Design a protein around this nucleic acid. Structure first.
Ligand SMILES: [Mg+2]
Ligand SMILES: [Mg+2]
Ligand SMILES: [Mg+2]
Ligand SMILES: [Mg+2]
Ligand SMILES: [Mg+2]
Ligand SMILES: [Mg+2]
Ligand SMILES: [Mg+2]
Ligand SMILES: [Mg+2]
Ligand SMILES: [Mg+2]
Ligand SMILES: [Mg+2]
Ligand SMILES: [N+]
Ligand SMILES: [N+]
Length: 387
RNA sequence: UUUCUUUUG
RNA sequence: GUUUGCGCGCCAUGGGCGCGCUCUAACGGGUGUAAGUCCCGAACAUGCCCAGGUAGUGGGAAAUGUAUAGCCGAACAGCAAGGGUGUCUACUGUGAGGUGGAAUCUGAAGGAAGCUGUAAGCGAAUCUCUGGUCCGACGGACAGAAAUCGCAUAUAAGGCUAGGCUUCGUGAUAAGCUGGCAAAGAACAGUGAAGUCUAAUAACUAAGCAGAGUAAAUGCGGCGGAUAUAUGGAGAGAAAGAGCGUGCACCUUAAGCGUGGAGGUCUCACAGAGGUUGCCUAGUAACAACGAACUGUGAGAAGUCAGCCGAGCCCAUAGUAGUGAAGAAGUCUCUGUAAUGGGGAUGGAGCGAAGGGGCGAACAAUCAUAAUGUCUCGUAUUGCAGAAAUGACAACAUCUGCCGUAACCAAUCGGGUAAAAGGUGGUCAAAUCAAGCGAGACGGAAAGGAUUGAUUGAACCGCCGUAUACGGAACCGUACGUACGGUGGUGUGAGAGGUCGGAAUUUCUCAAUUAAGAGAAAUUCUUCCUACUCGAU
């Protein structure tokens, strides 16, 4: 009923295109992703018969390419009907769902009143889970033992099958969230339960830790299991705050997200990096493009102004280290529009690099407009047009 | 905001 | 491929060693046998304070200058022999080229042992104590080595910049430290260790704390050593210092003087070897390849001269220049280092170059040369859903944030957060039966066995010892400064030309005028070669 839908030729061509677009690692064989076409040309119908007769041993550990490919086939066939039993407020590893929808929904709930955060960390997912409960959970909606057999062989030994299986296993948690009547948002394994009282939140946390320990068979540790306000919650990289104009909560990038971004910006604009500065500007604009495109729902305007100023100052000392010789430095300064005596005065302070690049003549020698034409996207324009 | 020289990836 | 960078010889204006002569503390005194040393005295100018912000007067506490014989000479200025150019012009050569002019750059950290004048700086045996700096390699500080100890150090020690907050509100001398960091110096600015010295007079018109920012990596402490940028001081010290002149079979020196330049490259003239209807012998950087454009003899010109795996042999100037009897090679013998060495005695003549190529030992890297247990048929079962004949009972799952309070609430007032008041589901055990996938045991049919050779090492970063020179004592540099010895570290820059060697690609040939099956023409990538042009040291 389902096994030929697994081995539909169009489904395997979709799995083919997906795994060659993934460009994954080699696994344990050392087999390359560019040679799976041969692996289907001469060793394809053998694998089809082996799966249809249940003789395949998927090779464990480091995930190989053909294992990933048939895993993508099983994920592509189970992205249908088992999806419709999922609750609406599960937002990870699903089609047409991103983290921004989860953030907007959570913001709607806390702006509707429920503001006490129950954070539960279902840590270390696939080495604490009981196997046979997961198999009978699959079998609660499936009947073909071929699918059960292949996922059982895979479970003892990456692609999309492991996140799909996690979303299947924690779907009972969302079912219980609905039946208890609670407000919650779960991304993929870290769920936040959203209630409007403190004693209620402590009761919910102890009830759900006992419910997880007893019925669903997982384990929760004490390293990210707190109850706190949105003033102290980090969730998917988003911190939360409340506006002084007291009507709505708002979401912002968390401080550790900004610290990671600042580490990446400082490494990409390392002063002693022996590459062209246009290469640095391209890698930068890649990074602000992605990083704004993640946090584009958050109020971040002051953060972009400060980070943009920091980016421009870092590129100024990158330019100043690139020129590197004071005669070349004064030559470039008088080329860029500085009068000669002051240009040679600042160029014969070619060292003290932070001191020169922080203020003075080089802020107008290489300004906002020159670095804008040079190829850099200023943060505020991209944030305003994206939000 | 030192009207200076040299050395290095 | 970074102005110069090679060998040999001469020469001090460099340095020792003596011998004389003179001078040595503003200007003068004393003390003493003896003062260059020890002690004392006058004025002016500057710095600092008499402030409340500054100029100009009046005054004052330390300090410095005019002011020791003299030394040195800026990252100061001018001159400047010499060198270069791919810019132009003259001349001379048959030509490769040469020479003289202009114009410009250079005249350098290693010998015109460059010249002149400065700013600034320095300025006396020896001894005790002490501050600071530097050193005891390189190597993110392992390994490796002759090359300090312990600890810390990259999601970044430590330093530093601009702030913020909390405590709090005499100077001088001056090596050094820092000025947001690759390293080092100089200038300027701010601070400034150690001890000493002062702690006088009158007026006027800072320590901590958290952050944020910034790194081509070192930081802190001990121990040992050095310290003439005449290192900052302190205490002894009747102690030496400086200039000039002169000797010394004294010792040395990369841009000074003289003289050599092989090897390769290039020009010309004769002969041959060709092409052409007497003339051509090249060009494309060289290799290659087109092309007739190659070969010997002879005459010429420019010219060398950069450690990276290289002991050594070979080619040529060449056993020549040059040294050597004011004594070589060899031998013997005391020694020194990690290594290169240095004396003493015989002995009787030898010793002995330069650049560029080949060959290459050694070295490094790379490549080639008797179970157990799984596949596999049956047995006892067990891991996990669903179904409920039926029993045990009204206590259990689950959601809901509070009682009074100043007449009003977030402990904004006192106790508490499974805090009161509450809702919603009834809760647990199943007899037996039972989906689909497995998990090992229990058995037996079938397997199965725990030295040689080639290639590469292109280039580059350096440090250390001695000798020898400089910028700038130390440190950083001068091609690792150079020479000779020791040592680690990285890995094959872009173009262009050739190899179009090897692999793919387009088009033909064969197989069938069929493949990504073999061959050929072309295209692209790749291996290799080339300072030809750049790039790096
Ligand atoms: Mg250098
Ligand atoms: Mg003076
Ligand atoms: Mg050292
Ligand atoms: Mg080091
Ligand atoms: Mg730090
Ligand atoms: Mg002194
Ligand atoms: Mg000549
Ligand atoms: Mg070499
Ligand atoms: Mg050095
Ligand atoms: Mg160098
Ligand atoms: N040179
Ligand atoms: N070097």
């Amino acid at each position: 009923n389902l096994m030929e839908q697994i081995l539909s030729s169009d489904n395997l061509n979709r799995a083919y295109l997906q795994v060659v677009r993934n460009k994954g690692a080699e696994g344990v064989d050392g087999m390359k992703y560019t040679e799976l076409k041969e692996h289907l040309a001469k060793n394809g119908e053998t694998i089809k018969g082996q799966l249809r007769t249940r003789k395949y041993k998927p090779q464990p550990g480091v995930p190989t390419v053909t294992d990933r490919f048939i895993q993508q086939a099983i994920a592509q066939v189970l992205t249908p009907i088992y999806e419709e039993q999922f609750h609406d407020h599960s937002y990870g590893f699903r089609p047409n769902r991103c983290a921004q929808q989860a953030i907007l929904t959570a913001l709607n709930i806390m702006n509707d009143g429920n503001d006490w955060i129950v954070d539960i960390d279902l840590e270390k997912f696939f080495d604490t889970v009981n196997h046979d409960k997961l198999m009978t959970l699959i079998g609660r909606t499936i009947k073909d033992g071929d699918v059960i057999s292949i996922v059982r062989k895979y479970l003892v030994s990456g692609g999309n099958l492991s996140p799909l299986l996690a979303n299947i296993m924690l779907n009972e948690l969302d079912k219980e969230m609905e039946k208890r009547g609670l407000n919650f948002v779960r991304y993929a394994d870290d769920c936040i339960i959203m209630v409007g009282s403190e004693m209620s939140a402590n009761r919910v946390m102890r009830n759900i830790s006992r419910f997880i320990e007893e019925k669903l068979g997982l384990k929760v540790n004490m390293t990210k299991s707190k109850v706190d306000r949105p003033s102290g919650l980090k969730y998917l990289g988003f911190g939360f705050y409340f506006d002084p104009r007291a009507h709505q909560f708002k979401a912002k990038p968390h401080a550790k997200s900004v610290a990671k971004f600042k580490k990446r910006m400082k490494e990409l604009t390392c002063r002693s990096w022996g590459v062209s500065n246009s290469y640095k500007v391209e890698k930068l604009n890649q990074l602000i493009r992605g990083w704004i495109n993640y946090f584009k729902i958050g109020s971040m305007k002051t953060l972009c102004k400060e980070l943009d100023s920091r980016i421009r100052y870092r590129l100024r000392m990158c330019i100043w280290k690139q020129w590197k010789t004071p005669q070349n430095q004064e030559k470039n300064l008088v080329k860029l529009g500085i009068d000669r005596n002051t240009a040679r005065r600042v160029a014969y302070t070619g060292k003290r690099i932070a001191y020169v690049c922080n203020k003075g003549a080089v802020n107008v020698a290489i300004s906002n407009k020159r670095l804008a034409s040079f190829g850099l996207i200023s943060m505020l324009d991209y944030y305003i047009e994206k939000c």
